[PDB]
Amino acid sequence: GPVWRKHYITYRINNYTPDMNREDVDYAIRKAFQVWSNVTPLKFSKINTGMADILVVFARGAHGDDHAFDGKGGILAHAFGPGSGIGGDAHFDEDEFWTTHSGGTNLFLTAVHEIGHSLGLGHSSDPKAVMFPTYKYVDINTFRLSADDIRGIQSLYG
């Protein structure tokens, strides 16, 4: 599977969801990248101009990449594994109701999961893992990567 060959990775937030305040989207995304940078030699920097390695997009239905979202319900987001262009990009279904906590789809947890894919991780068969396919809500204070998530990401990046 492909990996980022550099440790300095940039991300850009293409647009924001109207479900949450802009600062709350920024925080969730920054903290989701922090989860992964804490256990790898990767460094993530937010850029607002030019081409980023990981583009963060909020979109509904068809949005130009041949993988149309499915409206409210079904899946929540999708991301592409490391590579040029669309590679690494993380898209969030705008037909979902994104939340800072629960009572909708938690952006932080979904971004942790999608960024894991942006970095080259597949799904985990450990029910405790953030890379486990099932959406599971946990509070941001309680949230921790499982041993399986750590083993998976360190197997790729050290």
């Binding site: 149309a68 899946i75 987001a77």
Partner: protein, 92 residues
């Protein structure tokens, strides 16, 4: 089967959404896994009737699935198969 690769198994009465992939210029049926972040299975029929070639059309279908041969850019969590449709009907 219209599929090039050997039949893995038969799928029965799956519910999906029809869409068109512009990269490989082929129609597919998308089935999402409920309560998952991003688990999706794409079924690329090699025998789809033109009657069902409509964007966002919801169908109930059955068929024989094989590994896909298409060179396609897939997001993580999305897997694709070739499908020889045995039955397909428009729903809602």
């Amino acid at each position: 089967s219209c599929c090039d690769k050997e039949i893995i198994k038969d799928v029965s009465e799956l519910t999906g959404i029809i869409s068109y992939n512009t990269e490989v210029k082929r129609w597919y049926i998308s089935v999402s896994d409920a309560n998952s972040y991003d688990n999706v299975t794409l079924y690329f029929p090699c025998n789809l009737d033109s009657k069902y070639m409509k964007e966002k059309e919801k169908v109930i279908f059955s068929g024989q699935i094989s590994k896909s041969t298409l060179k396609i850019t897939l997001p993580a969590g999305t897997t694709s198969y070739c499908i020889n449709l045995m039955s397909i009907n428009k729903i809602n």
